Automatic annotation (TrEMBL), chain B:
The chain holds residues 17 to 612 of 849 of the full protein. Mg(2+) binds at residues 364, 410-411. Keywords: ATP-binding, Metal-binding, Nucleotide-binding. This is SIR2 family protein. It comes from Kosakonia oryzae. The lineage of its organism: Bacteria, Pseudomonadati, Pseudomonadota, Gammaproteobacteria, Enterobacterales. ATP binds at residues 310, 335, 360-365, 437, 521. Residues 339-447 form the Novel STAND NTPase domain. The keyword Methyltransferase does not apply.
Amino acid sequence: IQSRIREISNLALNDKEYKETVFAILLLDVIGLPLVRSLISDVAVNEKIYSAEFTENEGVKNLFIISNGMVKTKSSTLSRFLIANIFEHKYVVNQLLKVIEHLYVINKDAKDHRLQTLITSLLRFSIIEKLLPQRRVEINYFYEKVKHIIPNLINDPH
Amino acid sequence: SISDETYERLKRLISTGNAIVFVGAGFSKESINIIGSTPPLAKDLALQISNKSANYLKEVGADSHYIEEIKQCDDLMVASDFFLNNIPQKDELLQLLKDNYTIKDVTQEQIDIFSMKWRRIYTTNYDNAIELSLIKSGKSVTPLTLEDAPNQYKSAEDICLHINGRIERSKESDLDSAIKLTTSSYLSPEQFLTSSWYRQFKADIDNASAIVFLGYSMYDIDIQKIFFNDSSIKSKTFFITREGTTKFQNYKLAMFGEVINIGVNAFSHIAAKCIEESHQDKEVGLINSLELYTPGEEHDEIRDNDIANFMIFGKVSDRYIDEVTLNDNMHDKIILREEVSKIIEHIETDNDILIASDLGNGKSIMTRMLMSKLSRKGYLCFYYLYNEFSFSKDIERLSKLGQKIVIFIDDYSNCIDDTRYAIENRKDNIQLVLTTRHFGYENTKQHLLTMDMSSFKTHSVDYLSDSEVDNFVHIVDHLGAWGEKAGLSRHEKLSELDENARNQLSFLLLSILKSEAIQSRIREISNLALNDKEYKETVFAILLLDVIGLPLVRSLISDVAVNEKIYSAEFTENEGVKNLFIISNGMVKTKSSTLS
Amino acid sequence: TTNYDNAIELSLIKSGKSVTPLTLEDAPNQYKSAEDICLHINGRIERSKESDLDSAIKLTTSSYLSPEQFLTSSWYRQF
Amino acid sequence: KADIDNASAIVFLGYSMYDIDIQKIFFNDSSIKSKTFFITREGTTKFQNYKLAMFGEVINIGVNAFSHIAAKCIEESHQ
Ligand SMILES: Nc1ncnc2c1ncn2[C@@H]1O[C@H](COP(=O)(O)OP(=O)(O)OP(=O)(O)O)[C@@H](O)[C@H]1O
Ligand SMILES: [Mg+2]
């Protein structure tokens, strides 16, 4: 099976935007937020979800159950396998840092509650351990760089 | 001869400046070439190339009977094919073509006839008489061939298109397919039908005021097949032939339009009269298939009965929409969808909009609200009317304007041909808004993904937020249609609905206000599915298995349906079976309990 | 030539001589046996499209810094 | 198309090949060229039938001579 999943995932994850959007879908499903097109646009840091050619890809159709253009996951045992094995840890930590910076950067104006709870939910250790399982160096690097991305975190005991 | 009323009709049609000329062999009969003579016809050229090949075979030393039987061969196609397939020196054939088809000087009638303003120029010549005649007369020209993409030259003018090729920058290998000389070239899979310029040619001869053929002998069969069928095209075309020709000689041409046997010489004088008026004419015309949306100018009172009509019975006026648009605090009269602002922000950045939704979840009303707001922002919004008038003429007249334009099309699956043309030949200052149901979108996926959809933003209005649920129940609270349920809180009220039907406007309307309009829509869609007894039995079996609660399985469905239609692949491609049961990978599941 | 106009071509045509004008987007092997090569190094006007101003017609300060130039073309060896 | 794909050989009896569609069918391929035989009239030079030679092998013997081949081959075809 793993070989089948790898072959059918390499047919979509080779593009940069497709990889970012797929990672955004997996990340928001991991946190538990609703999979809304406008919010997945902010998490994915592009607007490829609005194109009509995203939902007709091999990887997107073969890994996610699509229905009337919407995207939802198949099961947790495939999403967590994708997160652990198909996405490298070194990609995951860097993309997490990028989206954490960008959310704040565009949230300093709009003041949306969903972005705020997204940011304070990414900082929790349970999600990070569910995203980077038993990786000491990457977890340490992420925790030591999040305080330098945004300077208000030092005053927060959370 | 040719009558005076035909003269007046021709002058009036050519003075518009939207005429199209088709140039043939007879136009450049008087020109002169590099070797200082009139360009030759097929007979002389065939004799020359046969003589050349026979001289080569005499040099190699073949029998004299073969030479004497090849020399008298005056068929251009067979002689050229034999030369290219047996004789190895094709460089001198290309040199002979360049010598014979390079015009050095033109006459004055050609200058006067090509100093007009046309829509587009089409020709079947090899020479450069037309390009020389356009420069000399004070106008630019960019020639092309069938091997050029028309989308790159969209904004260019003075497009002189050569159909059977050109010799000006022809290479050695172009004789096989590009230049239509041999029998092998005419049989190639690459022809005028397969080229992308064919659709452009059809649109041009559909859109033009009149079409003029200059000395065309009507040899090609594809143009004959284009022009034979229709009659509205025949009423616009004209043919120009040489003098001293009887009607029976022009009988072949007469089946495709009027025949005027005066020659290019006499048409040059008409061109001399019409040149000054050709460049001046301009008219905004009238737009027939698209009505210009205009905002409200007066304040009308809104009465409860209007609230009841809009909420339940589906009847509303555009004055109501314009009134709820100007003031955003009036939540007791309309539901404010959050997608309108996103859609507006997308349309301000040169992006097309495609809206897809389920049955009756607020799509046409969203289109009307968008139309009302975008004119206030400063655009021009046109609503597509399902009329019998043309659409290419109207989009052309819209392009001739100079304002920012948004065009709205509702339920495009019923006008897929026009909606295609719209995405095929869209201009720079015209955006598109297309709305459709899910079934209509999925039935036309293969007709649209082949084009450029990178400029389209896809939106779905199927679901709302909890704030909009609160707004809806606030509207009903102001209406007071709860009855005995008004005492209970928010949670109790909607306790009888399913999770996903709660977040859809159609099921909310049917469950709370019992909108008859939605009932009529459901009856209309389900009638076309439940007409057959087999499908009726299968649908009733699915509903029975759901109200029991036991899971759905193909064998069980077939057992309780007293048939085997569930095994057929056409059961899940019906109208009602798709619009009433959500399907996924061929399986059938129901939407919600309040629908079943 | 370096001009973008058609004076050379009109002069050749008016003197009883043919011409095949090209640019740097043509390969030399397809025109190996050709004669009267009027190669326009900078560009051409006669059938220029809208995208030819960026790199094909050398006029702007961006069309002089593009990776495609006279050196990297296939006509450099021929010249 | 399927019949000329599955057959053993294709025989033309006095066909001048006037229609353009059979011409477009038979001109492209080369495997169909090996199985195609054209039967034309007697007393014809090679050139008089150069057009037919492009699509397959041509035999200038007529139906008159083909009758003898049919009479010699009939008893084997049914067997
Ligand atoms: N913005 C809105 N605010 C309040 N009610 C609305 C709104 N939009 C739609 N409705 C209600 O929904 C009903 C059906 O909406 P509408 O006719 O626009 O559906 P639709 O999706 O365009 O239809 P169809 O898909 O069948 O073409 C209307 O009669 C109206 O009562
Ligand atoms: Mg509608």
